[PDB]
Amino acid sequence: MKNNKDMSLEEKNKQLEQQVTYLQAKVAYLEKLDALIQSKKSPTKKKRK
């Protein structure tokens, strides 16, 4: 169900190989948010303070 928000979940994209790539993690964000890092964003490289 397209969330009341603007960026609906259906807006999510899909690829050939990346299909399962994000479908595994994205499933967490897109679940309620959308096709993007929101709930639990992956770990970023060593950020130099």
Q: How many C-beta atoms surround the C-beta of residue 30 within 10 A? A: 19
**Pair 29, 37: CB distance under 8 Å:** yes
Measured at the CA of 28, the angle between CA 33 and CA 16, to 5 degrees, comes to 100
CA distance 23 to 9: 12
Residue 23 within any structural domain of the chain? yes
20 φ, ψ (degrees, to nearest 5): -80, -20
CA distance 37 to 39: 6
Residue 6 within any structural domain of the chain? yes
| Domain with 1 in it | 1-40
**Pair 39, 28: CB distance under 8 Å:** yes
Residue 45 within any structural domain of the chain? no
Number of domains, the chain: 1
Three-state SS annotation for the chain: CCCCCCCCHHHCCCCCCHHHHHHHHHHHHCCCCCCCCCCCCCCCCCCCC
24 φ, ψ (degrees, to nearest 5): -80, -50
Residue 22 within any structural domain of the chain? yes
